[PDB]
Structure 1
Amino acid sequence: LQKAVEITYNGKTLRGLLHLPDDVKGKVPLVILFHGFTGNKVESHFIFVKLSRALEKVGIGSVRFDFYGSGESDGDFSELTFSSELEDARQILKFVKEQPTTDPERIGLLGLSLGGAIAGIVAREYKDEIKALVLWAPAFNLPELILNESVKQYGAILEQLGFVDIGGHKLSKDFVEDISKLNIFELSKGYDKKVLIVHGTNDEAVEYKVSDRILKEVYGDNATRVTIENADHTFKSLEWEKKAIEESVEFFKKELL
C-alpha cells in the first residue's frame, strides 16, 4: 500500500510517501529513509522507491519524506542547513510513531550519504527507540569535505555573494557555518544496536576509506559492512543496486524481526 503523507511543524510543511504491506494487518515494523545532499524522497535512479517496495514484500513498512527546502516539501535550498534536516528527521520519527499501523518496538533507520550522517546521529539520539540502522555510503566526513571545499574554492564567493551555486541550488553561507561546528563521527557514537554499512569501492563522493573510519571509530563489533566491489556512490547499476537493497532487506528482516 502506497499513499502520500504530510507533516507540518512551525511554518514548514513536509511532503512524503508511506508504505505498508497489504497482506498483513495489525502493527508492522517500519524503516524511515533519509535522502542525501540535493536528493529527494525517490533518490538516485529511484533506489529509495525500489527499496521501499522491496520492504513491503517482506511485511516491513517504510516512510520516505522530502527534507524542507528540497523536493516536494516547502522552502528553498538556501534556507536549509544540516541541523535543519536534523529537526526535520525528529518530526518524521515522531509522526511515524503516531501511526496506528506502526509498531513502536520495531523501528529502523536508513540514510544515504548526507542522509546517512543524519541517520547515524538520530540513531544515537533515540538509541533505545531504534532497533536497527542501515547506512548507505555514510558521509560522516561531510564536515571536512564542505570545509575543505570552502577554502580551496567557493570561500570568497560565499562571503561576497552570501551563497554559491552548486548546480541549480543555492548553497547558503549559513549551511557552511552550521556544519562547521558538527562532527558526525563523534555525534553518531553511542548507538549500540545492530548497524549495517553499504559502501561502494569506486565511490568518488564519499571515498571507501571513510567506512573504515566509521567501523573503527564510531561503532564496535555491532556494525558490519557490505562492500559492493567497483560500485559508485549511489550503486548506479542493476547489479550494484540489487546487492545494496537485498542485503539491506535481509538485514532489516533479521534485526527488525
Structure 2
Amino acid sequence: MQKAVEITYNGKTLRGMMHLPDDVKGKVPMVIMFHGFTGNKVESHFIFVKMSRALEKVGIGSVRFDFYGSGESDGDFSEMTFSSELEDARQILKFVKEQPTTDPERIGLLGLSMGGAIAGIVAREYKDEIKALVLWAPAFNMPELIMNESVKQYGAIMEQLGFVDIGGHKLSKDFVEDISKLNIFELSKGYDKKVLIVHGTNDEAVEYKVSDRILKEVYGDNATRVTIENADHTFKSLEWEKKAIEESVEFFKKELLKG
C-alpha cells in the first residue's frame, strides 16, 4: 500500500510517500530514501518508486520525501543548503520512528548521490538505531565538486548575482558557503553496521573512484561494493536499474528481516 504523507516543522512542510507491505500487516522494517541534487523522491526514471515497490514485495516498507526547496515540498531551491537537507533528514527519520507500523529495530537508510552523503551522515549520527545503509553513487566528494565549480564560474557569477543558474534552479551563495565547510567522509566515519555501496563504473557525475575512497577512509570490513559495469550515474537502463534494485533489496532483506 502506498499513501502520501506530510511533515510540518519550523513552518516548513515536507511532502512525501509511504509504502507498507499488503500481505504482511504488523510491525515492519522501514527504509528511508534520500534523493539527489536537483532530483526528487521519484528520482531518475522513477527508480526510487521502483525500489519502494520492490521492498514492499519482500515485506519491507519505506518512505521518501522531497527535501525543502525541491519537488512537491515547500520552499524555493534558493532556500536550500546541504545542512538544511540534513535537518529535513532528521525530521524524516523521526517521522518514520513514530509510525505504529514501524519496527524501530529494523530501520535502514538509502541515498543517491548527494542523498547518499546525507544518508552516511545520518546513519553515523544515529549509528545505534540504523540497522543498515545503502549508498547509490554516494557524492561524498560533493564539497570538492562544488568548490571547483565555484572557482570556475560560480564564484564569479555568485559574486555578481548572489546565485547561479544551474539549469532552471537558483543555486544560492548560502549553499556553496555551507558545503565548503563540510567534510562528508569524516562525518560518516564510525558507522559499524552493514553497508552496501552501488556504483556504475561509467558514472560521470560522481566518479567511480569516489567509492574507492569511501571503502578506504570511511568504513572497514562492514562495507561491501556492488560494481555495475558500464553503468552511468542513475543506472539509466532496465538492466542497470534492475541490478541496483535487486542487490539493494537482497541486502536489505538479509540485514533487516533475518533475526
Once superposed, what is the RMSD of the aligned Cα atoms? 0.4
Cα offsets for 1:63-89 (capped at 9, x unmatched) = 010000000000000000000000000
CA apart distance, 1:26: 1.1
The residue aligned with 1:182 is 182
- For residues 143 and 154 of structure 2, what CA distance do their matches in structure 1 show? 15
The residue aligned with 1:223 is 223
Cα offsets for 1:198-257 (capped at 9, x unmatched) = 000000000000000000000001000000000000000001000000000000000112
CA apart distance, 1:8: 0.2
Matches within 5 A, 1:133-148: 133-148=133-148
- For residues 105 and 30 of structure 1, what CA distance do their matches in structure 2 show? 9
CA apart distance, 1:124: 0.3
- For residues 190 and 5 of structure 1, what CA distance do their matches in structure 2 show? 32
CA apart distance, 1:25: 1.2
Name the SS for the 2:73 alignment partner: coil
CA apart distance, 1:152: 1.6
CA apart distance, 1:153: 1.8
Cα offsets for 1:104-151 (capped at 9, x unmatched) = 000000000000000000000000110000000000000000001110
- For residues 50 and 16 of structure 2, what CA distance do their matches in structure 1 show? 15
Q: Any gaps of 5 or more consecutive residues in structure 1? A: none
Cα offsets for 1:5-62 (capped at 9, x unmatched) = 0000001000000000000111000000000000001000000000000000000000
Name the SS for the 2:243 alignment partner: helix
- For residues 52 and 121 of structure 2, what CA distance do their matches in structure 1 show? 22
- For residues 25 and 233 of structure 1, what CA distance do their matches in structure 2 show? 35
The residue aligned with 2:87 is 87
- For residues 12 and 141 of structure 1, what CA distance do their matches in structure 2 show? 28
Name the SS for the 1:129 alignment partner: coil
Name the SS for the 1:67 alignment partner: coil
Length-normalised TM-score, structure 1: 1.00
- For residues 62 and 168 of structure 2, what CA distance do their matches in structure 1 show? 30
Cα offsets for 1:179-216 (capped at 9, x unmatched) = 01100000110100000000000000000000000000
Name the SS for the 2:195 alignment partner: strand
- For residues 221 and 48 of structure 2, what CA distance do their matches in structure 1 show? 27
Q: Any gaps of 5 or more consecutive residues in structure 2? A: none
- For residues 97 and 186 of structure 1, what CA distance do their matches in structure 2 show? 26
- For residues 77 and 163 of structure 2, what CA distance do their matches in structure 1 show? 10
- For residues 174 and 24 of structure 1, what CA distance do their matches in structure 2 show? 45
- For residues 89 and 28 of structure 1, what CA distance do their matches in structure 2 show? 20
Are 1:161 and 2:153 counterparts? no
Displacement over 6 Å in runs of 4+? none
Name the SS for the 2:182 alignment partner: coil
Name the SS for the 1:256 alignment partner: helix
CA apart distance, 1:155: 1.2
The residue aligned with 1:50 is 50
- For residues 200 and 95 of structure 1, what CA distance do their matches in structure 2 show? 32
